[PDB]
Design a protein around this ligand. Structure first.
Ligand SMILES: *C(=S)c1cc(C(=O)S)c[n+]([C@@H]2O[C@H](COP(=O)(O)O)[C@@H](O)[C@H]2O)c1
Ligand SMILES: CC(C)[C@@H](O)C(=O)O
Ligand code: NI
Length: 425
């Protein structure tokens, strides 16, 4: 028996005792007893930055970037200390904007802002959404040597004090989330993101979970974030039960890299050899709201599945497939091969196409069996995965296909784990 992450509930799965490896879990580091108290300490004694109170002295306006619903940041723990310090520094609440760094996602709803930030904060401060398809809401900052123009939300660019908050987890393109990613793509225009999420970046072998140095995705969004600037970040890591295990604050690069150095010691989970069947999740609510995001569970499993193996994913998909643009690509391109011909041979850019490219990367290596009650089977079958009614059935089907030597690995927290093959094991 194992509980996979699945919406707000989890999912209780029975897996074959004689076939299944011990579950891949992140290392059990101690949670912080008082993470808000720790945030307070880190604001007074940050990494590579003056104390936030000293940074905020004499500033007339502030913009605080926060993640949208898809990231389970415990925002009030981070924001209450920040907001207290800004008030102490003399900034009035009307001088402070909380900007939801949607990237190219849809805007957060009023209810989501309350879920993300607490009723007290959502009611007291101006909270606005980034709109990536609205170029007019962005300021041009220059073009990188790789040819990517930097278009960043003007409300942030024009703020006296720039602050970003977030969460360091593995990421299938940028290696890890957090730090600079709140700026690029969090408040970057489609004119920027379409190129940065273009196949010239995404087909690179190091554009993958866990890779920073040498990953052009990370080199480029670091460069673009530095063209905008960021005076101060606060980032956390979360364990499997969503307790904060570390807080980093200060310089946008130095604090981020300190947080990554910690999370690298807990998120890696090794098997001695790749396996024919990998059971995984999309890390539950809120990440697994859409099929668009749940592709992350599929890419996360790739390092430990054998070529031609099967990934079995469970995800609640309570919000369905994703954006209208994302959904339209399945209708416009019934095969992944035709989709990849479209985007590889010409400069063809459609919102959210990058996740279809990631799904194509998955399907070049593995079959996928998809278990969900949030999207009908008939719909999922048009999404280049095989809908199966239960994980237990899906595993039984895969084990018959691969035979009596086949083994099962299981990753209950899905893309929040970094599975690796360690032959020395
Ligand atoms: C990372 S590539 C990324 C991409 C998008 C797209 O729409 S593309 C959106 N976001 C959002 O930006 C915020 C910061 O990202 P992080 O990965 O959590 O550091 C967050 O609100 C993401 O949902 C990111
Ligand atoms: C799913 C990916 C492509 C992006 O939208 C993100 O939220 O990380
Ligand atoms: Ni993105």
């Amino acid at each position: 028996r194992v509980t996979l992450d699945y919406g707000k509930t989890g999912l209780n799965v029975d897996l074959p005792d004689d076939r299944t490896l011990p579950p891949l879990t992140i290392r059990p580091a101690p949670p912080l007893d008082d993470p808000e108290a720790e945030v307070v300490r880190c604001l007074a004694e940050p990494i590579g930055s003056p104390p936030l109170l000293d940074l905020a002295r004499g500033k007339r306006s502030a913009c605080i970037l926060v993640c949208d619903i898809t990231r389970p940041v415990p925002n009030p723990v981070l924001l209450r200390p920040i907001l207290r310090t800004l008030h102490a520094a003399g900034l009035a609440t009307q001088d402070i904007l909380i900007l939801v760094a949607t990237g190219l996602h849809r805007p957060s709803t009023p209810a989501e802002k309350v879920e993300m930030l607490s009723e007290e904060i959502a009611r007291t401060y101006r909270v606005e959404d980034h709109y990536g398809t609205r170029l007019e809401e962005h300021t041009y900052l220059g073009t990188t040597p790789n040819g990517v123009p930097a278009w960043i939300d003007s409300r942030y660019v024009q703020a006296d004090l720039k602050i970003a908050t977030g969460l360091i987890e593995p990421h299938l393109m940028a290696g890890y989330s957090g730090g600079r990613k709140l700026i690029c793509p969090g408040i970057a225009a489609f004119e920027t993101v379409k190129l940065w999420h273009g196949p010239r970046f995404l087909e690179h072998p190091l554009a993958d979970c866990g890779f920073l140095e040498g990953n052009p995705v990370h080199e480029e969004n670091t460069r673009i974030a530095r063209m905008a600037g960021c005076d101060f970040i606060v980032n956390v890591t979360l364990d499997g039960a969503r307790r904060i295990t570390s807080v980093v604050a200060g310089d946008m690069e130095q604090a981020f890299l300190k947080g990554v150095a910690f999370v690298e010691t807990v998120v890696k989970a090794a098997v001695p050899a790749p396996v024919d069947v990998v059971v995984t999740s999309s890390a539950g609510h809120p990440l697994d709201l859409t099929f668009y995001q749940a592709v992350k569970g599929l890419t996360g499993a790739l390092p430990i599945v054998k070529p031609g193996g099967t990934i079995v994913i469970a995800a609640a998909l309570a919000e369905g497939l994703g954006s209208p643009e994302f959904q339209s690509l399945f209708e416009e391109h019934p095969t992944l091969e035709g989709f990849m011909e479209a985007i590889l041979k010409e400069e063809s850019f459609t919102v959210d196409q990058w996740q279809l490219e990631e799904l194509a990367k998955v399907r070049r290596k593995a079959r996928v069996k998809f278990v969900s009650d949030g999207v009908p089977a008939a719909v999922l079958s048009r999404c280049h995965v095989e809908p199966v009614a239960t994980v237990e059935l899906a595993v039984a089907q895969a084990l018959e296909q691969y035979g009596p030597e086949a083994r099962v690995a299981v990753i209950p927290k899905g893309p929040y784990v970094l599975p690796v093959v360690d032959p020395t094991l």
